[model samples]
Target chain A: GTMYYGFDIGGTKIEFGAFDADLVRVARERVATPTESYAAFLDAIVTLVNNADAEFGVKGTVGIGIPGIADVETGKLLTSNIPAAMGHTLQRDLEERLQRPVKIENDANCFALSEAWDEDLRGEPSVLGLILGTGVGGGLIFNGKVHSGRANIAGEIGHTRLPYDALKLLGMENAPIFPCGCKNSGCIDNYLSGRGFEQLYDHYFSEKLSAPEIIAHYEQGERRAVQHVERFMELLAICLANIFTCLDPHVVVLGGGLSNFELIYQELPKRLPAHLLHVAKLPKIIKARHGDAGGVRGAAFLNL
Target chain B: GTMYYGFDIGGTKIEFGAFDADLVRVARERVATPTESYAAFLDAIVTLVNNADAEFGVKGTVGIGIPGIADVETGKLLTSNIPAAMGHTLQRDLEERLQRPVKIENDANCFALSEAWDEDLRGEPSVLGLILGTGVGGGLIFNGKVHSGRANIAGEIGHTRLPYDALKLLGMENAPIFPCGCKNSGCIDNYLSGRGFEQLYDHYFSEKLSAPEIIAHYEQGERRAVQHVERFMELLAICLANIFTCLDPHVVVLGGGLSNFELIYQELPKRLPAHLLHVAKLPKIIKARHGDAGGVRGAAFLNL
Candidate 1:
């Protein structure tokens, strides 16, 4: 059985792993990403692949999960998350450097595929991988396949706008429109990410706090912190319900920084609009089994 | 090539059409719907199918597009659009009466299938049919097939909540959350339908006016009417952008009464949020080529 080498590239580091033919994880390693230079980043990835090959004593297929998209027409990576990788021919560079074909996918979508590959979850025809982390994003697996749609932008939910009518009704109309890196305002990404939680905490209490700090406060029943979390759950429910209405994936696998919150798993389903829950059996909401390892595992499974 | 029989059931009439194996419309007829009784409704449909047989000189496989859903679990019609048909085993009953298997789909989905069958449009792997008429709805066509999803509510976008943040930013914070027949409020159905337009006109102007009448006033530069139409376009753009963000469909086909407004086809694209437009090419938006007859044609193509 052939081994698979998978890499998940982030702004600061690249996490690498190897999966055997049955898609079981075999080895793992991580290194600082030289994101400031495309050549360095390429070299780092090559070294990781070579190390895996040497350790396993087998040539392995390669796949990568990127923070952003690889444009189909130009085959350039388009991402402000890792600016040095912007406009670079990542797939072609990797393929030439490693002397084999390489598969690349959006990191969030990789999370989706990893969830879909679960033996218990794969029986369902469609799976949605939702990442609630530094930013909101999703990936779709339909009919047991990653459906990247026409442009590979499928399941890019982070950039989608939040509901203005619901926001107005809630009277949060004065809330500042955080500009997304994508240069959009009022996107769910602006508020649903870890940074969004920190910013919300700062706005409500005039205190800069990490997501963990805020969660600690909420657990202690701090007034403002509790309010912010309730609001977060409300907004998340609206977004999830909206996405479910569109794709109707059988199971939604949650990952990323925020999915760890016990409250999301407990209350998110209850928050879905009554009409949606009535028409569609609320998808089985559960945390991703692969957890932090999902992206790497999914990348390895890419083209399996 | 064998023939396909399709029926599109409405509140008061059933539109019937037959298609050849290549999906060309062969004959068409319209008959009054006996909506007050289940038995009468069944008889009406049976008579229409028999009439098609007499006209085409061939019995054909039957497919129906109803103004509601046939719940997969109960195998019954769950429709508020025509209450008499509620709880009826419409598909099974039709199958038994017609002495063959019958394919039944939501009317909106049929419209989606009809549009996807077009030679130019069929090349795309995914198509989203957007219905802006008496009620807002959508149908998903993926891989040249109608995707009913897990619960048969796959593309039921009508019930999704309206964007609160965008609407608040637009300064219509006082807008009433119109409850849908589906027992939910803030649904796109409340704003995008002809009845919705009329209700919005009534709310804004303190006068009752039809959707066409409102469009006439907007064209003539009436103040409130123009404002309402502008806001409508804004909300619609938000919904479309959100949907595209999730599905990233290759094309979105528009049908129903509200789609007749030229401004929608022209201005809707420009209203999409910048981030969405940049990530994926704006889906080509075109009117339903089959127009009012799409439901029937699509139903005929359901199993072909």
Candidate 2:
């Protein structure tokens, strides 16, 4: 049966999946992250992983994902949004409680690893994956393997500062904050992520809308909605262009809950060349195959 | 007998060396560049490399350095400061002219590789070698090997836009007037390189001075000169701190003419931490072992 279990620990919830080596999902579940009570959190993983192992015949090696900096040496969390796991061995604690070997990584890092491990990338030299949901996460695949940086936080694109404060409209405190860990403020994440998109929707539409609904409104020739989305893609283009000019990756895979929005597909490619220096080597922008499943696959990729 | 040859072609000079099996240089030579005719340049290399091979009784792989973007596929010099090589098959030209196999890379890239190949950085896990002379150049050594970027221009750190533009105080014309292929301007190189330093010196000293004279005057305890040099170090520190925050190298080795000055060694460590977001990761900033020969030594590593 060669089954495996994957877990993605977020700020509010922990998503769990049971899968075979071939990556077919047998069952999946989610739990509230009562991170404030640390020991109780470990107990929850023990219950879920044991049931998963028993049902799927998974022997060991659970992969867990958490938001924040990861120390590869100790398999611990640092400065995590989940305050309970901050500065503690979330991997070690979960493994000990579940009586299994485990690997832990930053969530964005995990999301990137999952896409590369899934065989969909087709042996590309490099892959940069981005999560632009509630927050921004990043991951990379190089030479057919996931490239976790020194602290397992290599693909943290969310932290890289954009030149302008695109989210100033939301007044910094309401939605997206200016400063990030990448040492600079006014990052692209604050402008392009889920909260960012919704804020744009509120400012323009004034009516309620999901990310996809906003995109559809613009695509159907709504002037106010289209203008806002156009600016979003332009902002995205400049940031991606900066990364492209520096690193020169083969492809950029867009993930997260908001990436499925259709405007990103149309407007991003249009604006990319406007900001590019060498348009020849610019990578293809594509959708993440995983969607929300990216977190689980990311965990599996980390375990491997 | 198998012998090799290498060339480091700069805007001002073209340097060549012939080596034996153990990669020991048997003969070395240099010539001033003739900017008029590109074909004459090829003729000159053909004469020089052929004479060396004929005299030394050796036929070995050749390595070269040029100031431009090297196309990943053809090894042609794409966008160049040396107008003669642009839009031409530089490696193929040398190979055919010299009648021997050759490989060419960006000079800045070579400088980094050169430092990594030196005994001081031997067996290091992650190494970043930088050159701060007329221009800023960088190379990455990962697991004892150079990480040549997508187009062989990965480590050119001079192109990064610094948070503050020191050069704008000098005329806008004074700031990176050259048409760099990066299609942008006001890079770190525009501040820390020779011209950058000179313009900065002119700003404070009320007298135009070369980078070397400025350093000499500062070292001799000229108070205003000391302040100018201190400000230079402060900006360079920000550059280093930015890299440390982003790339996360284990060690950074600095080379080139400006690094030879006493101030870079003395002042950098003090000023760098103030700008660092991740001060823990970018602690070690040391001098390169190869001295000014960092470029040549790096060429040897790439040729191998």
Candidate 3:
């Protein structure tokens, strides 16, 4: 039976999983990520792969997804969340040690690839994956593969500043300058993610509330919460319209915490047509099928 | 001898050109575009192709650059400037009439393809074509081909609204709402185009100055004119940064009238770094190699 090894290296933990050629999850493992040194990181990954191979009595293709890109020029991983792995030749080193070829991609792109790899989604010429977690992330899948640009920073949707006209349309009298970790201000992440939802609530209500709490209130049709959600939807709709205008992907798959919200699927599309310049139909917007397992599952699907 | 026939179907005029296999411009012609009927439009194109073929003594592959997309779904041209041809199938009907394969593409994408098709420029894997004329237009080229999306509206950058934070950073407290022919407001075309520059002058100075006159005054260090140009550069920078953040194209080529301004080619790069989310280097920005001929030239180079 053909087997595949996959790893999702997150900020805190590294999750490992094995899949048969049929994509069935046969084995799974999780361990704390080695955040101190590159050698330790490599060793931890290699050890996990070895144990999986020994137990399964078979070698397999390895694929890993990291928080950031593998800079093609320097062979270094350009990521802040994992400082120790920054300059490490992870792909080449891992392949040499495992005696097999390996694929390393940004986690969001892997998420997009994983979604696109499924039988139902495989035929789309282009797929854009938007992850609305604590932060917003995006990845592009073309021809069922990750299209890491020359800089390996393609599909970064959340970093761009929110459109001024969109804010004005929302009756925002002032541009709320939200600082981003990437050293930018007023990024889409400032208002569209889980934490962004909280920030937007605080910006409007002068009271802090968690994402779930705000959503719970919004669900009840509370005026302020409902208004905030409307603004968020409008902002997201603008972002999606801009993206679709530029790329016109076959589908835009939403994932992460905020994707669970019901209104995004219902209300956002109506707001999208106003922003689109042409009369092209909006690309299908739906949540990812993998749920929380998307990162690991997508990592496993890298070579597919 | 291999021959290629191309048409630049514009809002006002139709420009025709023929190219040898070596890509040399062998013949060129121009005529007014029919504003009344699709039949007239088709007849004009047929007449041009017939004349080119009869003179060249070879049936040629045909390519056309239009103001809008030919909807892959409906096979109807979804044109705004030319309403008569809005529901027409220019490609299929043209091929049937001429008895040869034909290609139809948005003019902006064709502009991008023309640049990408050149031997030196083709080295870059991805290219963005930006046309800053009376309107703002964009086209994306991937692997030396127009990356036309499902609706064939993939590179419609002119439609996306200007980012509010960017304008605020540039110190515009009030969003200058400019109405667009697309029934939208505050499109990039409203501020970055030749007319956009004039509108910016009208907004700030209560005076209507042509694009060239405004640039001339700015060059002479006129205060209001200088400030307007500064705002224009800032807005353009934000647009380019947002585009780069998502697509990360290898280079972005500038065309159209506004591209002639010296400040855009000089100071825009310095303002770009703060807007980028990742460490990917900014794509090089340069003026188009083909001057006024870009539209027709790009039209001819289609399917190359």
Candidate 4:
């Protein structure tokens, strides 16, 4: 039986999984990522694959999900998370070492592909996978394939400037335009990310709080928390409505830490319609079905 | 010996064209559209197709470009320009009457398809055809195919709300938000269309003028006209930059009347880079090669 070996490469840890053709996980393992040395990192992944091969008694096709982007044509990887792997032709290097072709993709795109891989969601014409974690990230999947645009940045919505109307509608006409890591100012990621959510709360009440703590306060019906969460939802609605106006995907699958907030699922549907085009009805918005395992599963699917 | 029959259906005039396999226009005719009755409108189109068949000495595949949307699943058309055609199964009726399969698409989408049909642009991965006429309309073409989205409204960027920063950056923070025909408020179309261009000038100087007249004054280096045109360029840059952040098409082909303005090509390139993400280079922005004939040509190519 043919098998697939998938890796989720992160800053702190590298996860490995072995799967059969049917997508059932047969074996899994992990190792601490070597952040200081590129050679060590290569050896780490090789060792993992070799060990898995010994155990499974089969040399499987390889696919990797990385924390950043891979230039499809050049084979170079661009990622801040893995400083050791930066500016290298990671795919080519690995392929030579393993004596086999390997597929690699950005983790966010992997998450999207994983969700799109779901049997229920397989029929959707277009699916948008949105991540609201350390930073906002997105991936577009159309007909079960990633639409990685001319520049491979088709769904990088987080870096896009937030609509100025979003602030004005929330009576935040004077909100400071935050600088973004992408070297742009006033990007949506600055306001919509988990850190951005905390910043928004701080901006409103001058109180610093984590996203979970803020959600807890809002659940308790605290006055300032209520105001802040409502404002966040309204702002998010405007941002999402603008996206709907442009792409109008069939469904949006939410991933990352913020997707766990139950209130978003309930409140977003109610708030979104007003911001949408008169002819447009709101698209189905749901949480990521595969959770954290999506990256590995999606990586395994890259060649399929 | 195969030929194509194309119809460009507008409120006042319906244009008919016959094209050979090479897309060379073989025969052409035009007639005033019947606005009083749906049956008459249907007869008008049937007559045009029949006449084209007789003239070409061969029956051909029929394709139509309408001023509005046609629901792919329902075959119902939604258009304000042709009130008689509203709520009708236009595709089905025309196919039955003509006794042949017919392809119908929105004029904006057809315009995009026409531009994408260009031999030079055929290799481009994605093309965005933007119409800046009576209203701001758009169509997205991916690898020579129109991505009409779920609601057949994928490229309806006109109805999307304009970024508030557009106003603030131009020192027009107090500018009154205009209501759109889409039953929404503050749509980019409200300020970016030809009429909107005039409205922007009128709002600034309290003087009503046509788009061409305003451009003439700007060419003369008139003080208020210079300021107004500069403001328009800046606002347009922000709007387009926001678009680039999301879809990131390989090229944008400008169509419609306002695209005739020479300054847009000259100035937009200069203003756009500042608003784009650091990682993204500006995509090529060019004038439409097909001009007004794009609708008919695109319609002809729809069945291909």
Top-TM-score candidate index = 1
Provide the overall lDDT of each model, using Cα atoms, as 2-decimal numbers: 0.81, 0.67, 0.81, 0.84
Q: Which lDDT tens digits does candidate 3 get at residues A52-106?
A: 9899999888889988878778677877778778778889998888898898888
Decreasing TM-score order of the candidates: 1, 3, 4, 2
In DockQ, how does model 4 score against the reference complex? Answer: 0.55
lDDT of 4 by residue, B198-260 (tens): 988998899989999999999999999999999999989988888877887889999888999
DockQ of all predictions against the true structure, Cα-based: 0.56, 0.29, 0.61, 0.55
The candidate maximizing DockQ is: 3
Clashing pairs in 4: none
lDDT by residue for model 1 over B1-304, one digit each (tens)? Answer: 4999988888777888888877678788888877668778788889888887887788998889987678778888878887668888888887887689999999889999888888898778788998888788889877877778777888888877776444553455566667778776677788778887788768767998888888999999999998988877876777777778778888899999888898988887788744364757787789889779888988887778
Each candidate's interface RMSD (Å, one decimal) is 2.1, 5.4, 1.8, 2.1
**Which sections of candidate 3 miss by over 4 Å?**
A34-43, A78-102, A219-224, B36-42, B83-102, B219-224
User: What's model 2's lDDT at B114?
Assistant: 72
Off by over 4 Å in 1: A54-59, A164-170, A174-176, A217-228, A273-277, B22-24, B53-58, B201-207, B216-231, B273-277
Q: Comparing to the true complex, what docking class would candidate 4 get?
A: medium
Residue A217 accuracy (lDDT) in model 1: 91
Residue A154, model 2: Cα distance from true site in angstroms? 2.2
Evaluated at residue B235, the lDDT of candidate 4 is 87
Model 4: lDDT equals: 0.84
Can you write out model 1's per-residue Cα lDDT over A1-304, one digit (the tens) per residue? 6898788888778899998877778898899878667788788889888877888888788889988788877888778888778888999988887789999999998998888877798778778888988788888877777778777888888877776433542455566567788776777787788898788778767988999999999999999988988877886777777777767777888899898998998888778744264656777889989879888988888868
Which of the two candidates, 3 or 4, achieves a greater lDDT against the reference? 4
Model 3, chain B only, scores a TM-score of 0.93
